[PDB]
Design a protein around this ligand. Structure first.
Ligand SMILES: CCCCCCCCCCCCCCCC(=O)O
Ligand SMILES: [Cl-]
Length: 133
C-alpha cells in the first residue's frame, strides 16, 4: 500500500513550469498570476483505507479523500469537475484527472525525504517539490 512516509504535513519549496501547466489546463490569466504566488501546504493522512490529500493556500483550499484504484468525483483548485483515480506504481502515488475529453496526471513520489509532484498536461512537465514540516 501507500508508504507511511507520504503521511504528514508538506510545504512547497520549489515550483518549475507551473504557469505553463496551468495554461495547458485552461486556467485564465488572473488565476494563473495568483496560482504562481501560492505556497501551499499539503497534508496527507489516512483513516483505514481512505487517504486524504488536503491542500491549503491563501487563494484556494482543496481536499480529496479516496481509496486506491476507485474512481471519484473531484473538484480541482481551478474548479474543474473531474473523474479522478489514484493508483500506486512502484511506490509512486499517481493521480489521473479526466474531464471534457481531456486528461492530466499528477505523480507524487518521495525523493531524499522530499515529496515531488510531477504534473503533466499537453507535454508540459511541471515539478513541485515539498519538504516535510
Ligand atoms: C491550490 C494550490 C494552487 C493554487 C492555484 C489554483 C489554480 C490552478 C491549480 C490547478 C492545479 C493544481 C495542481 C497542484 C499539484 C500539487 O499538489 O503540487
Ligand atoms: Cl499561500
Amino acid at each position: 500500500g501507500m508508504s507511511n512516509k507520504f503521511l504528514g504535513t508538506w510545504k512547497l519549496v520549489s515550483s518549475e513550469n507551473f504557469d505553463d501547466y496551468m495554461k495547458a489546463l485552461g486556467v485564465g490569466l488572473a488565476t494563473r498570476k495568483l496560482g504562481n504566488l501560492a505556497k501551499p501546504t499539503v497534508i496527507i493522512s489516512k483513516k483505514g483505507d481512505i487517504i486524504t490529500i488536503r491542500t491549503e493556500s491563501t487563494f484556494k483550499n482543496t481536499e480529496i479523500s479516496f481509496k486506491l484504484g476507485q474512481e471519484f468525483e473531484e473538484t480541482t483548485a481551478d474548479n474543474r469537475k473531474t473523474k479522478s483515480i489514484v493508483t500506486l506504481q512502484q511506490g509512486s502515488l499517481n493521480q489521473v484527472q479526466r474531464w471534457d475529453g481531456k486528461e492530466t496526471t499528477i505523480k507524487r513520489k518521495l525523493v531524499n525525504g522530499k515529496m515531488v509532484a510531477e504534473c503533466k498536461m499537453k507535454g508540459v512537465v511541471c515539478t513541485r517539490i515539498y519538504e516535510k514540516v
